[PDB]
Design a protein around this ligand. Structure first.
Ligand code: FEF
Length: 294
């Protein structure tokens, strides 16, 4: 803390606290991730890797104090929840699509790099004035809030894979398209009920093995019939609802990949030039791609 000026608190966690910062040299704003610590083993994914992608926050410096380790990142002034709330929870549809493509890029890179999001949610997704969406370095973990949790995990799943993150993508896509959470459950039991009311109660046909699950049988769920997603999110189009469907699959193994999610017809309007961009270049670089005023 000799070259930076620590400003207001942006957020907190059990493992770290984040502060808005400024350089005394360049005057540029930064994010100071204060890692909360005789000896402390540091496992930071931003330190044990180099997640160099246009949709992941970029690490700039490391500071050692006798009491802490501060990771200096690039700064974004609003998180997805703050952005939603600022435009009264009504995001321009073209932007929802740009935000979604961006989120799928960052995640498809993490997955490629064997990185998982243990807690994907709007507050961990950040947005700048150019319309860029990036994954904050918070809750990222090597492969070794109940709202965004998949049904299989809730019903006892030993598989902690990239597929978990895909259910969260579906949840956030809906939250962006409608301005409200898809399944805001308070208990494991209520969350499952909230899910089955939208997707339908699983049958041996839609989810093989369910009736053999001890915890599922004990909850006595009414046989709910699936409600058309397009009816729940009218601002969405046929392709938007189809991508949502393919994302919100009961079983992780059937959930579309982040790579394939990007090749879906919902994104056709964006063009072929966005698929050829290297990891490090912004999607906005293209004349064809631009943020719409809210
Ligand atoms: O710009 C930023 N670069 C980062 C690098 C790592 C962690 C956070 C941030 C960050 C943040 N920029 C902003 C802007 C508005 C609100 C929060 C916020 C940020 N981090 O807060 C995330 C905390 C997490 O616990 C979710 O609440």
């Amino acid at each position: 803390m000799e070259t930076y000026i620590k400003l207001d608190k942006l957020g907190e966690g059990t493992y770290a606290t984040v502060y808005k910062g400024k350089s005394k040299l360049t005057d540029n704003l930064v994010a100071l991730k204060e890692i909360r610590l005789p000896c402390t083993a540091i496992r930071e994914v931003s330190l044990l890797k180099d997640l160099k992608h246009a949709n992941i926050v970029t690490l700039h410096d490391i500071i050692h104090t006798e009491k802490s380790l501060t990771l200096v990142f690039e700064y974004l002034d609003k998180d997805l929840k703050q952005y939603l709330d600022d435009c009264g929870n009504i995001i321009n549809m073209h932007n929802v699509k740009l935000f979604l493509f961006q989120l799928l890029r960052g995640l498809a890179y993490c997955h490629r790099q064997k990185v998982l999001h243990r807690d994907l949610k709007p507050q961990n997704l950040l947005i700048n004035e150019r319309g860029e969406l990036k994954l904050a370095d918070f809750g990222l973990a090597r492969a070794k809030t109940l709202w965004y949790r998949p049904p299989d995990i809730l019903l006892g799943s030993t598989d902690y894979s990239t597929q978990i993150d895909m259910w969260g993508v579906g949840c956030i896509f809906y939250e962006m398209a409608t301005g409200r959470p898809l399944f805001p459950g308070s208990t494991v039991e209520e969350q499952l009920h909230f899910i089955f009311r939208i997707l339908g109660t699983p049958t041996e046909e839609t989810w093989p093995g369910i009736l053999s699950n001890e915890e599922f049988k004990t909850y006595n769920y009414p046989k709910y019939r699936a409600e058309a997603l397009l009816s729940h999110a009218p601002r969405l189009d046929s392709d938007g609802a189809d991508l949502l469907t393919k994302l919100l699959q009961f079983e992780g193994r059937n959930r579309i990949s982040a790579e394939d999610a990007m090749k879906h017809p919902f994104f056709l309007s964006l063009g072929e030039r966005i698929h050829k961009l290297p990891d490090t270049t912004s999607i906005f670089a293209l004349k064809e791609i631009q943020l719409q005023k809210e």
